[PDB]
Design a protein around this ligand. Sequence first.
Ligand SMILES: Nc1ncnc2c1ncn2[C@@H]1O[C@H](COP(=O)(O)OP(=O)(O)OP(O)(O)=S)[C@@H](O)[C@H]1O
Ligand SMILES: Nc1ncnc2c1ncn2[C@@H]1O[C@H](COP(=O)(O)OP(=O)(O)OP(O)(O)=S)[C@@H](O)[C@H]1O
Ligand SMILES: Nc1ncnc2c1ncn2[C@@H]1O[C@H](COP(=O)(O)OP(=O)(O)O)[C@@H](O)[C@H]1O
Ligand SMILES: [Mg+2]
Ligand SMILES: [Mg+2]
Lengths: 288, 515, 333, 342, 293
Amino acid sequence: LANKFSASTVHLEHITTALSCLTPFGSKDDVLIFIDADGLSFVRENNHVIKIQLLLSRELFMSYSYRNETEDHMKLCVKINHILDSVSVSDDIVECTLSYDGHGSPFVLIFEDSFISERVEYSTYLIKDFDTNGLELDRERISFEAIIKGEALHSALKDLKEIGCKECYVYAKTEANDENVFALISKSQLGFSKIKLPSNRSILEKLQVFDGDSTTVIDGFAVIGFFDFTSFDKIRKSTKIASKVLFRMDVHGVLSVNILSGIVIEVCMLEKESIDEAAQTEIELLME
Amino acid sequence: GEQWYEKFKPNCLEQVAIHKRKLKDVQEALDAMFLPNAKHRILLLSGPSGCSKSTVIKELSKILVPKYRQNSNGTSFRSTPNEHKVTEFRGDCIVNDLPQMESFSEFLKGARYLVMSNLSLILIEDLPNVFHIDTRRRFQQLILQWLYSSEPLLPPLVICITECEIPENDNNYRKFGIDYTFSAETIMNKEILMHPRLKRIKFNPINSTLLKKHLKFICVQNMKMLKEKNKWNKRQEVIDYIAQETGDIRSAITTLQFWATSSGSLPISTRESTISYFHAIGKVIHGSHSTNNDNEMINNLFENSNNLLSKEDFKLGILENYNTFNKGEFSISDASSIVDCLSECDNMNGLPESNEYGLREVRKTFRNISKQGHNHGTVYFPREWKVRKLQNSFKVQAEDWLNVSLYKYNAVHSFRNITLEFGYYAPLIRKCQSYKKKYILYYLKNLMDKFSDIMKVENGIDVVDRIGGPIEALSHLEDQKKERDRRLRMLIDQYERNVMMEETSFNDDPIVDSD
Amino acid sequence: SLAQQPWVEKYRPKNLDEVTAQDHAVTVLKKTLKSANLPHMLFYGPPGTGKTSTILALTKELYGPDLMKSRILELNASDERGISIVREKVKNFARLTVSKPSKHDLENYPCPPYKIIILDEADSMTADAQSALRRTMETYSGVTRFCLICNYVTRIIDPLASRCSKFRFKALDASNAIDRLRFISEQENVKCDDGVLERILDISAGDLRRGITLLQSASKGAQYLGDGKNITSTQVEELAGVVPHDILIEIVEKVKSGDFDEIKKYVNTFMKSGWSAASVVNQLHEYYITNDNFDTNFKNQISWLLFTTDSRLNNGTNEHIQLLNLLVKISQL
Amino acid sequence: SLWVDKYRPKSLNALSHNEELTNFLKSLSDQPRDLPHLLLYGPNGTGKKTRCMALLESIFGPGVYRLKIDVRQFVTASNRKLELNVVSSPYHLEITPSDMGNNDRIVIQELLKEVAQMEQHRYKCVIINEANSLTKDAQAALRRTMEKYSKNIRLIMVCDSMSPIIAPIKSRCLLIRCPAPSDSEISTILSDVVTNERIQLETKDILKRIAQASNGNLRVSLLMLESMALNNELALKSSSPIIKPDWIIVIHKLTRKIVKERSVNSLIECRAVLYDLLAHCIPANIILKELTFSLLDVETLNTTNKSSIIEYSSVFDERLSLGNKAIFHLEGFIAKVMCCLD
Amino acid sequence: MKLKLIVNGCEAPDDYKLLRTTINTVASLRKTAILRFNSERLTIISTPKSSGDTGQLWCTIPHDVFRLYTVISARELNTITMECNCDSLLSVFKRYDRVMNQGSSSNMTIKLQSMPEWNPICALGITFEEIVIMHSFKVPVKLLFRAQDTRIQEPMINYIQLMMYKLPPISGEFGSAFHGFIRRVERYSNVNHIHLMGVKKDDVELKIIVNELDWHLEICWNGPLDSVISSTHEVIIRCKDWKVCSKLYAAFEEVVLAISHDESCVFHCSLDRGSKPRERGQIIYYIARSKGL
Ligand SMILES: Nc1ncnc2c1ncn2[C@@H]1O[C@H](COP(=O)(O)OP(=O)(O)OP(O)(O)=S)[C@@H](O)[C@H]1O
Ligand SMILES: Nc1ncnc2c1ncn2[C@@H]1O[C@H](COP(=O)(O)OP(=O)(O)OP(O)(O)=S)[C@@H](O)[C@H]1O
Ligand SMILES: Nc1ncnc2c1ncn2[C@@H]1O[C@H](COP(=O)(O)OP(=O)(O)O)[C@@H](O)[C@H]1O
Ligand SMILES: [Mg+2]
Ligand SMILES: [Mg+2]
């Protein structure tokens, strides 16, 4: 089309499902959209402590046109009032097309049906001086890394949500004779509860506890990360559609979660400043 | 380990720190409420903290409930005799399948069943969250339903309200009555308080004699440690201090225990008591005996009773009662100065230092003319509320008159004119016209065109009385509103009939239930 | 609208070129036509000095009819401007990206890279709401510009007055706005005697809106009369509400002959005619101060007396009581 | 029907007093297309509302006098119900926001603006009774509402005092002074009324007394003429007593009491009369003015006492204007007057 | 005063569905409703004025629905006016609906009875069986005075400034598409005031808009829309009113829409019945301008 960026597709269900992963990050925040020949990137940052980045590949879109040769990518910002529900949708196929013509023009989403035509325009905003890329994982020093099934993690997160979890503990340990331990310990009004994943390959696949270096694997050291459940529960929806989840903790304490379902979601959340003595004692008792 | 005020609790009605007259009154009222068909249904006990309301209620229940409780025939829950003389409501109970506001209802709907063989005294000391507006409305509605209920039998209901002030908090910005005072008036409403089936008995702070007696008894009970620590010989003075510092028995016992347990010598202190409205007025007018420096007394009053002194009610009370100093026989210049100061304070947009200025001016003026030979008058609450009620009635009547004029004479007038001239001239004109109409009708009957205008005056609609009543100087609302609504409906019907131009009926044709 | 609008509304300046007596700020506003460097503005001045007209003309000149509807957000007293509104709506509009101009507007209009928020009558805003506007005015200054219009500058908190370039709109008198009124009269074919326009401006006391309304009333009266005679000063004075000089002379004579009964009787008779206390007070001040037949001490006292009575009147006091007290007090002196 | 309303003129030509104002109204109605906003200020009872209705009739025909009433509900910020009886006609509208006290601003924002946005091509006329009773916030809100939508609606306002009107509103409106009728005109009107009513009179001097007891207010003049005629069996004699409003007599008796007894107990007793007068919804300012000018009529007092009385009255009138409660200032005025008299 | 009504769901299912729709609609709008039993038809009224603002609902049901219809009264046309809580009747109707779904030929009997155990206050003795268990319900109700009943009147809509819009049948090929069109706007969180617009020359088209400083929603219809025997007709209405209209459209076939520019919206539903043809029951909903232009 006669626009800088114009995409059109028929697999609206996949786009709606992927975009539904951005609901838990609130409704008073903003969403950054990166437009590039590779595809689309959706970025959200909350409390300067958690960030989510969802990638939509070119192959997903039936037709893609990026005529802004001046810049290799375009940045824009949109307010999340109810945009989650807008891209949500009977028997007849529905064609979804996204249009954007440089800065200063609205982001247009048009749905074409047999007899119904929908068009929605979103105004753009000045890009916040805050850099959403400031939170990232250092690959040189990874405290540990784990691979888990999406269904089990989603069930565990739902269980923690039900009991009104207030604080979360990610506990990782690797020992000899192929002993792998990954647990979530919730501090809530119930007290202290523990959910431990099994050692079966089908659920928990492959684990390292490097101790910081990403080269040498040691056995006996336990990595503990303390998080606010408010940030930890923002990945439950992303995990519901997940087919595989990759967890990574660095020495600095940043948690990285890669969600694979050809749509990839990368989430980074920070660890709490300190651990109380009572919590550490209860963790030790629970793991003995 | 056990605190003394709990360890040394009354074991009988004779050990309760309650005056004989109040105890006898409570006994008589409660005994009356226990009768088969008792006129009174609720006992509302209101008083300060630690005046032995719940204590005396429980002690009297322990004696009364066994007397009237009907004997069972093996229908008791357990083998025990069901020692449940008092059933109390717990405000922090959170059951699973129940909204919070419905908790008290679920209590009351159960409490009704505790009668006859299951007789039990229903005590409500831990109120629900009455600070929540919806919860308070539900509580008031439930109490009204209890009072207006139509069951042959109900159990006695006792509500003990500890009247205390609510300190000015940052998290609260509303300025309702309950946000200022936690008392029966703010929790209940006029209809409940004025109900003929509700009896209200006000408790007083425990007098010094009973406090001294009970403190002496407590000291006598603990004699080994007091003698060992060498505090026996000086106990009396301490007790006296407590007796003249607080009227709260629980606080007094706590302070006595704290003093006794201390190995060294710590100054004796008790909880602070808020100065009442009339006590504050008296402090401002006649001064305080405990202090001679007016500045210190005023600073203490402002720091400890800012909530009471900030309201315009206190200023109005000062204006109303400043004339009772010497029964009014004092220099008019002082009265003029006081009133001028209050008027100028009224222009300071309710700043706290405006109140400071007003109170300090009143105190200084009264101290200047103070003398030993003074006889005082009676302190009265300002009557601004009565003026407001009369104004509301006047507004309702003026609205009714305006509606009548609009729908019967095609005339619209301002309310200001109603207040100024119409409200007096029009009723007089209508009354005299009606009198002349009666005279003409009687003359014609004995024996209209000449005085057709007078013939058009209708007695059933036209107002023939002064709005707000005659000005008696120098020689309720629901009924008026319903009358205005009825007159408006009649006027609308007449206007519609002109435009085109009854329970007796129902009783005359009772329904027919034919199958 | 040529014959179906009030003269004040029909002659509202459309462009900055026709603003009469605000050159000190109109020049600054014009030179930024091609600067892309418009700062935050605080216009303050007495009523009817040409503040709203100036900002409207500026917006029209910079953006034009098509782009004005998208680059301008106007709020006034009639709109609800609580602290929540300032936090949400104003902030959201300020953070918005400027809409892309078309080819025509770019060809014919500067189309600056920033929008405008016009908070007319900002003196009616609460202190907290004004405080909420402080950092928003600064964070999004690269895409948004603020304009606050007021009559009482003191009602604006100091931080906002510091954050905004201040423009004072001077009062318009016979030496600043005679040309505009003469142009309006010429286009309306209004006939009047020499000096009538100057008298109307003087009566307006620094408000061209009042002068235009008075001119319209005088023209209506002349047309109804249908005598083909120039309008004289007497008619404009009578329609303005100025007390006649004869009544002022009689009041002065009553005051000079100190007598409470006579003074109060005459005051009752005068106030039963509907005259405004402000006009008579102003006339008395003029007569007493400009007269050279009185001593310095009497003028010193009467100045304070008149000031106190005028301050009382501005508070919404009973005109009858205040006028009687003023007359009695001057009689005592 | 009340003689005040049943004789209300229904046309500009019918007016028989203040011919200059009638001619000005004729001139205004000559070209009813560019009529600016009007603000009629004048003493109460002059006939300002009658003149406004006559102008509306002369402009938009006789449908204006066919009044209709409706109930318009208002919701405030705190979800509070407000009821304002909206008096509307097919050609004009009437409102009294003063009845809403400090909430009148909402009426300016929700009623006037909504109707102004609606397009009628002619304009609608809106009347605001007791304009001087409007709060400053409402007056401020009226400014841009009037300026922006002058095409659709032209505003008419009525007041007895322009002092409580903010400068912007006076700038935005065309001021019209309404002089009160003189004694002669009131006498002629009363003479016509009595002649048409077939009521008996002895001498015209009685009418003059009726003119004097009112002293400008024609409404009370007619009301008390009717009261006297009915009381005297439709026979007005020279010696027939004049009937005054009850609160007037109460205020005069209070003034006599103040003069007689300058004591604290006298102040306490007068407080009850002040409470009764306020309970009759009598404005505090009018109470103060009437008390002051009844005190100033006492023959016993000398020049100094009267000067002090008027000074205190003005000071306490300002305090009432700036104050919340009214009892303080009235009681202070009475106490200071009594102190000075003693 | 004698009231006796007999209803059978199995016989004449269409009119039973009409009654279900009326009861559900009245119970989904307010707490109490007016029931006028006349010698010819039954009227159900949901109006703010009881014994922009909220809309009004008027349902007319022919007397031929009820197998037995005995309405006797001392008033003109034997009119009986009652005020009844919508929730109680709605619960009884759910009970009857589920009983019928279970499979039974029982008839619902409605009678008016006086209650001395409890503006006279009476009860409705709704009784039906369930295959046997006897189901009985004493629904409280208030008898309304003749004048008070006369006060309530049907709103009148100008027919010169109003243009009717014919909607496709729900059972037609375009019925599902139009239902989806209607429900498009019932899935946005903060949207509360929708903007209906109708453009003449598809002979006519209907659009739904939502304008906001940040959002711009706009839905077009491309199906064949007919006009019942000038192009600018817009009205702003609350989302609850549009949802009620959406639910109403899903039940009836001959649905008609009308927009009185900046004045109001009218939603008319009729149920054709064969025989001349019997009286056509109607459901009319009036919605006032929520905000307006
Ligand atoms: N001789 C005594 N008489 C009364 N109470 C006593 C006595 N000795 C100890 N107490 C205790 O002192 C406390 C005060 O009595 P309460 O009746 O609970 O006070 P209150 O009237 O209920 O005021 P609140 O609302 O509970 S703060 C109770 O815990 C009593 O058991
Ligand atoms: N400088 C001026 N040049 C020409 N006409 C003017 C000027 N100032 C005022 N006017 C006229 O008077 C009217 C007053 O309009 P505004 O500009 O809104 O006055 P204002 O300065 O806003 O007064 P306030 O502060 O809002 S009460 C204009 O519409 C013009 O008709
Ligand atoms: N020119 C006039 N001729 C005869 N009666 C008049 C005239 N002007 C006013 N009135 C009478 O005065 C009465 C009250 O006037 P009103 O409209 O209340 O004056 P205002 O608006 O100043 O209060 C009216 O009922 C009317 O009959
Ligand atoms: Mg207790
Ligand atoms: Mg302005």
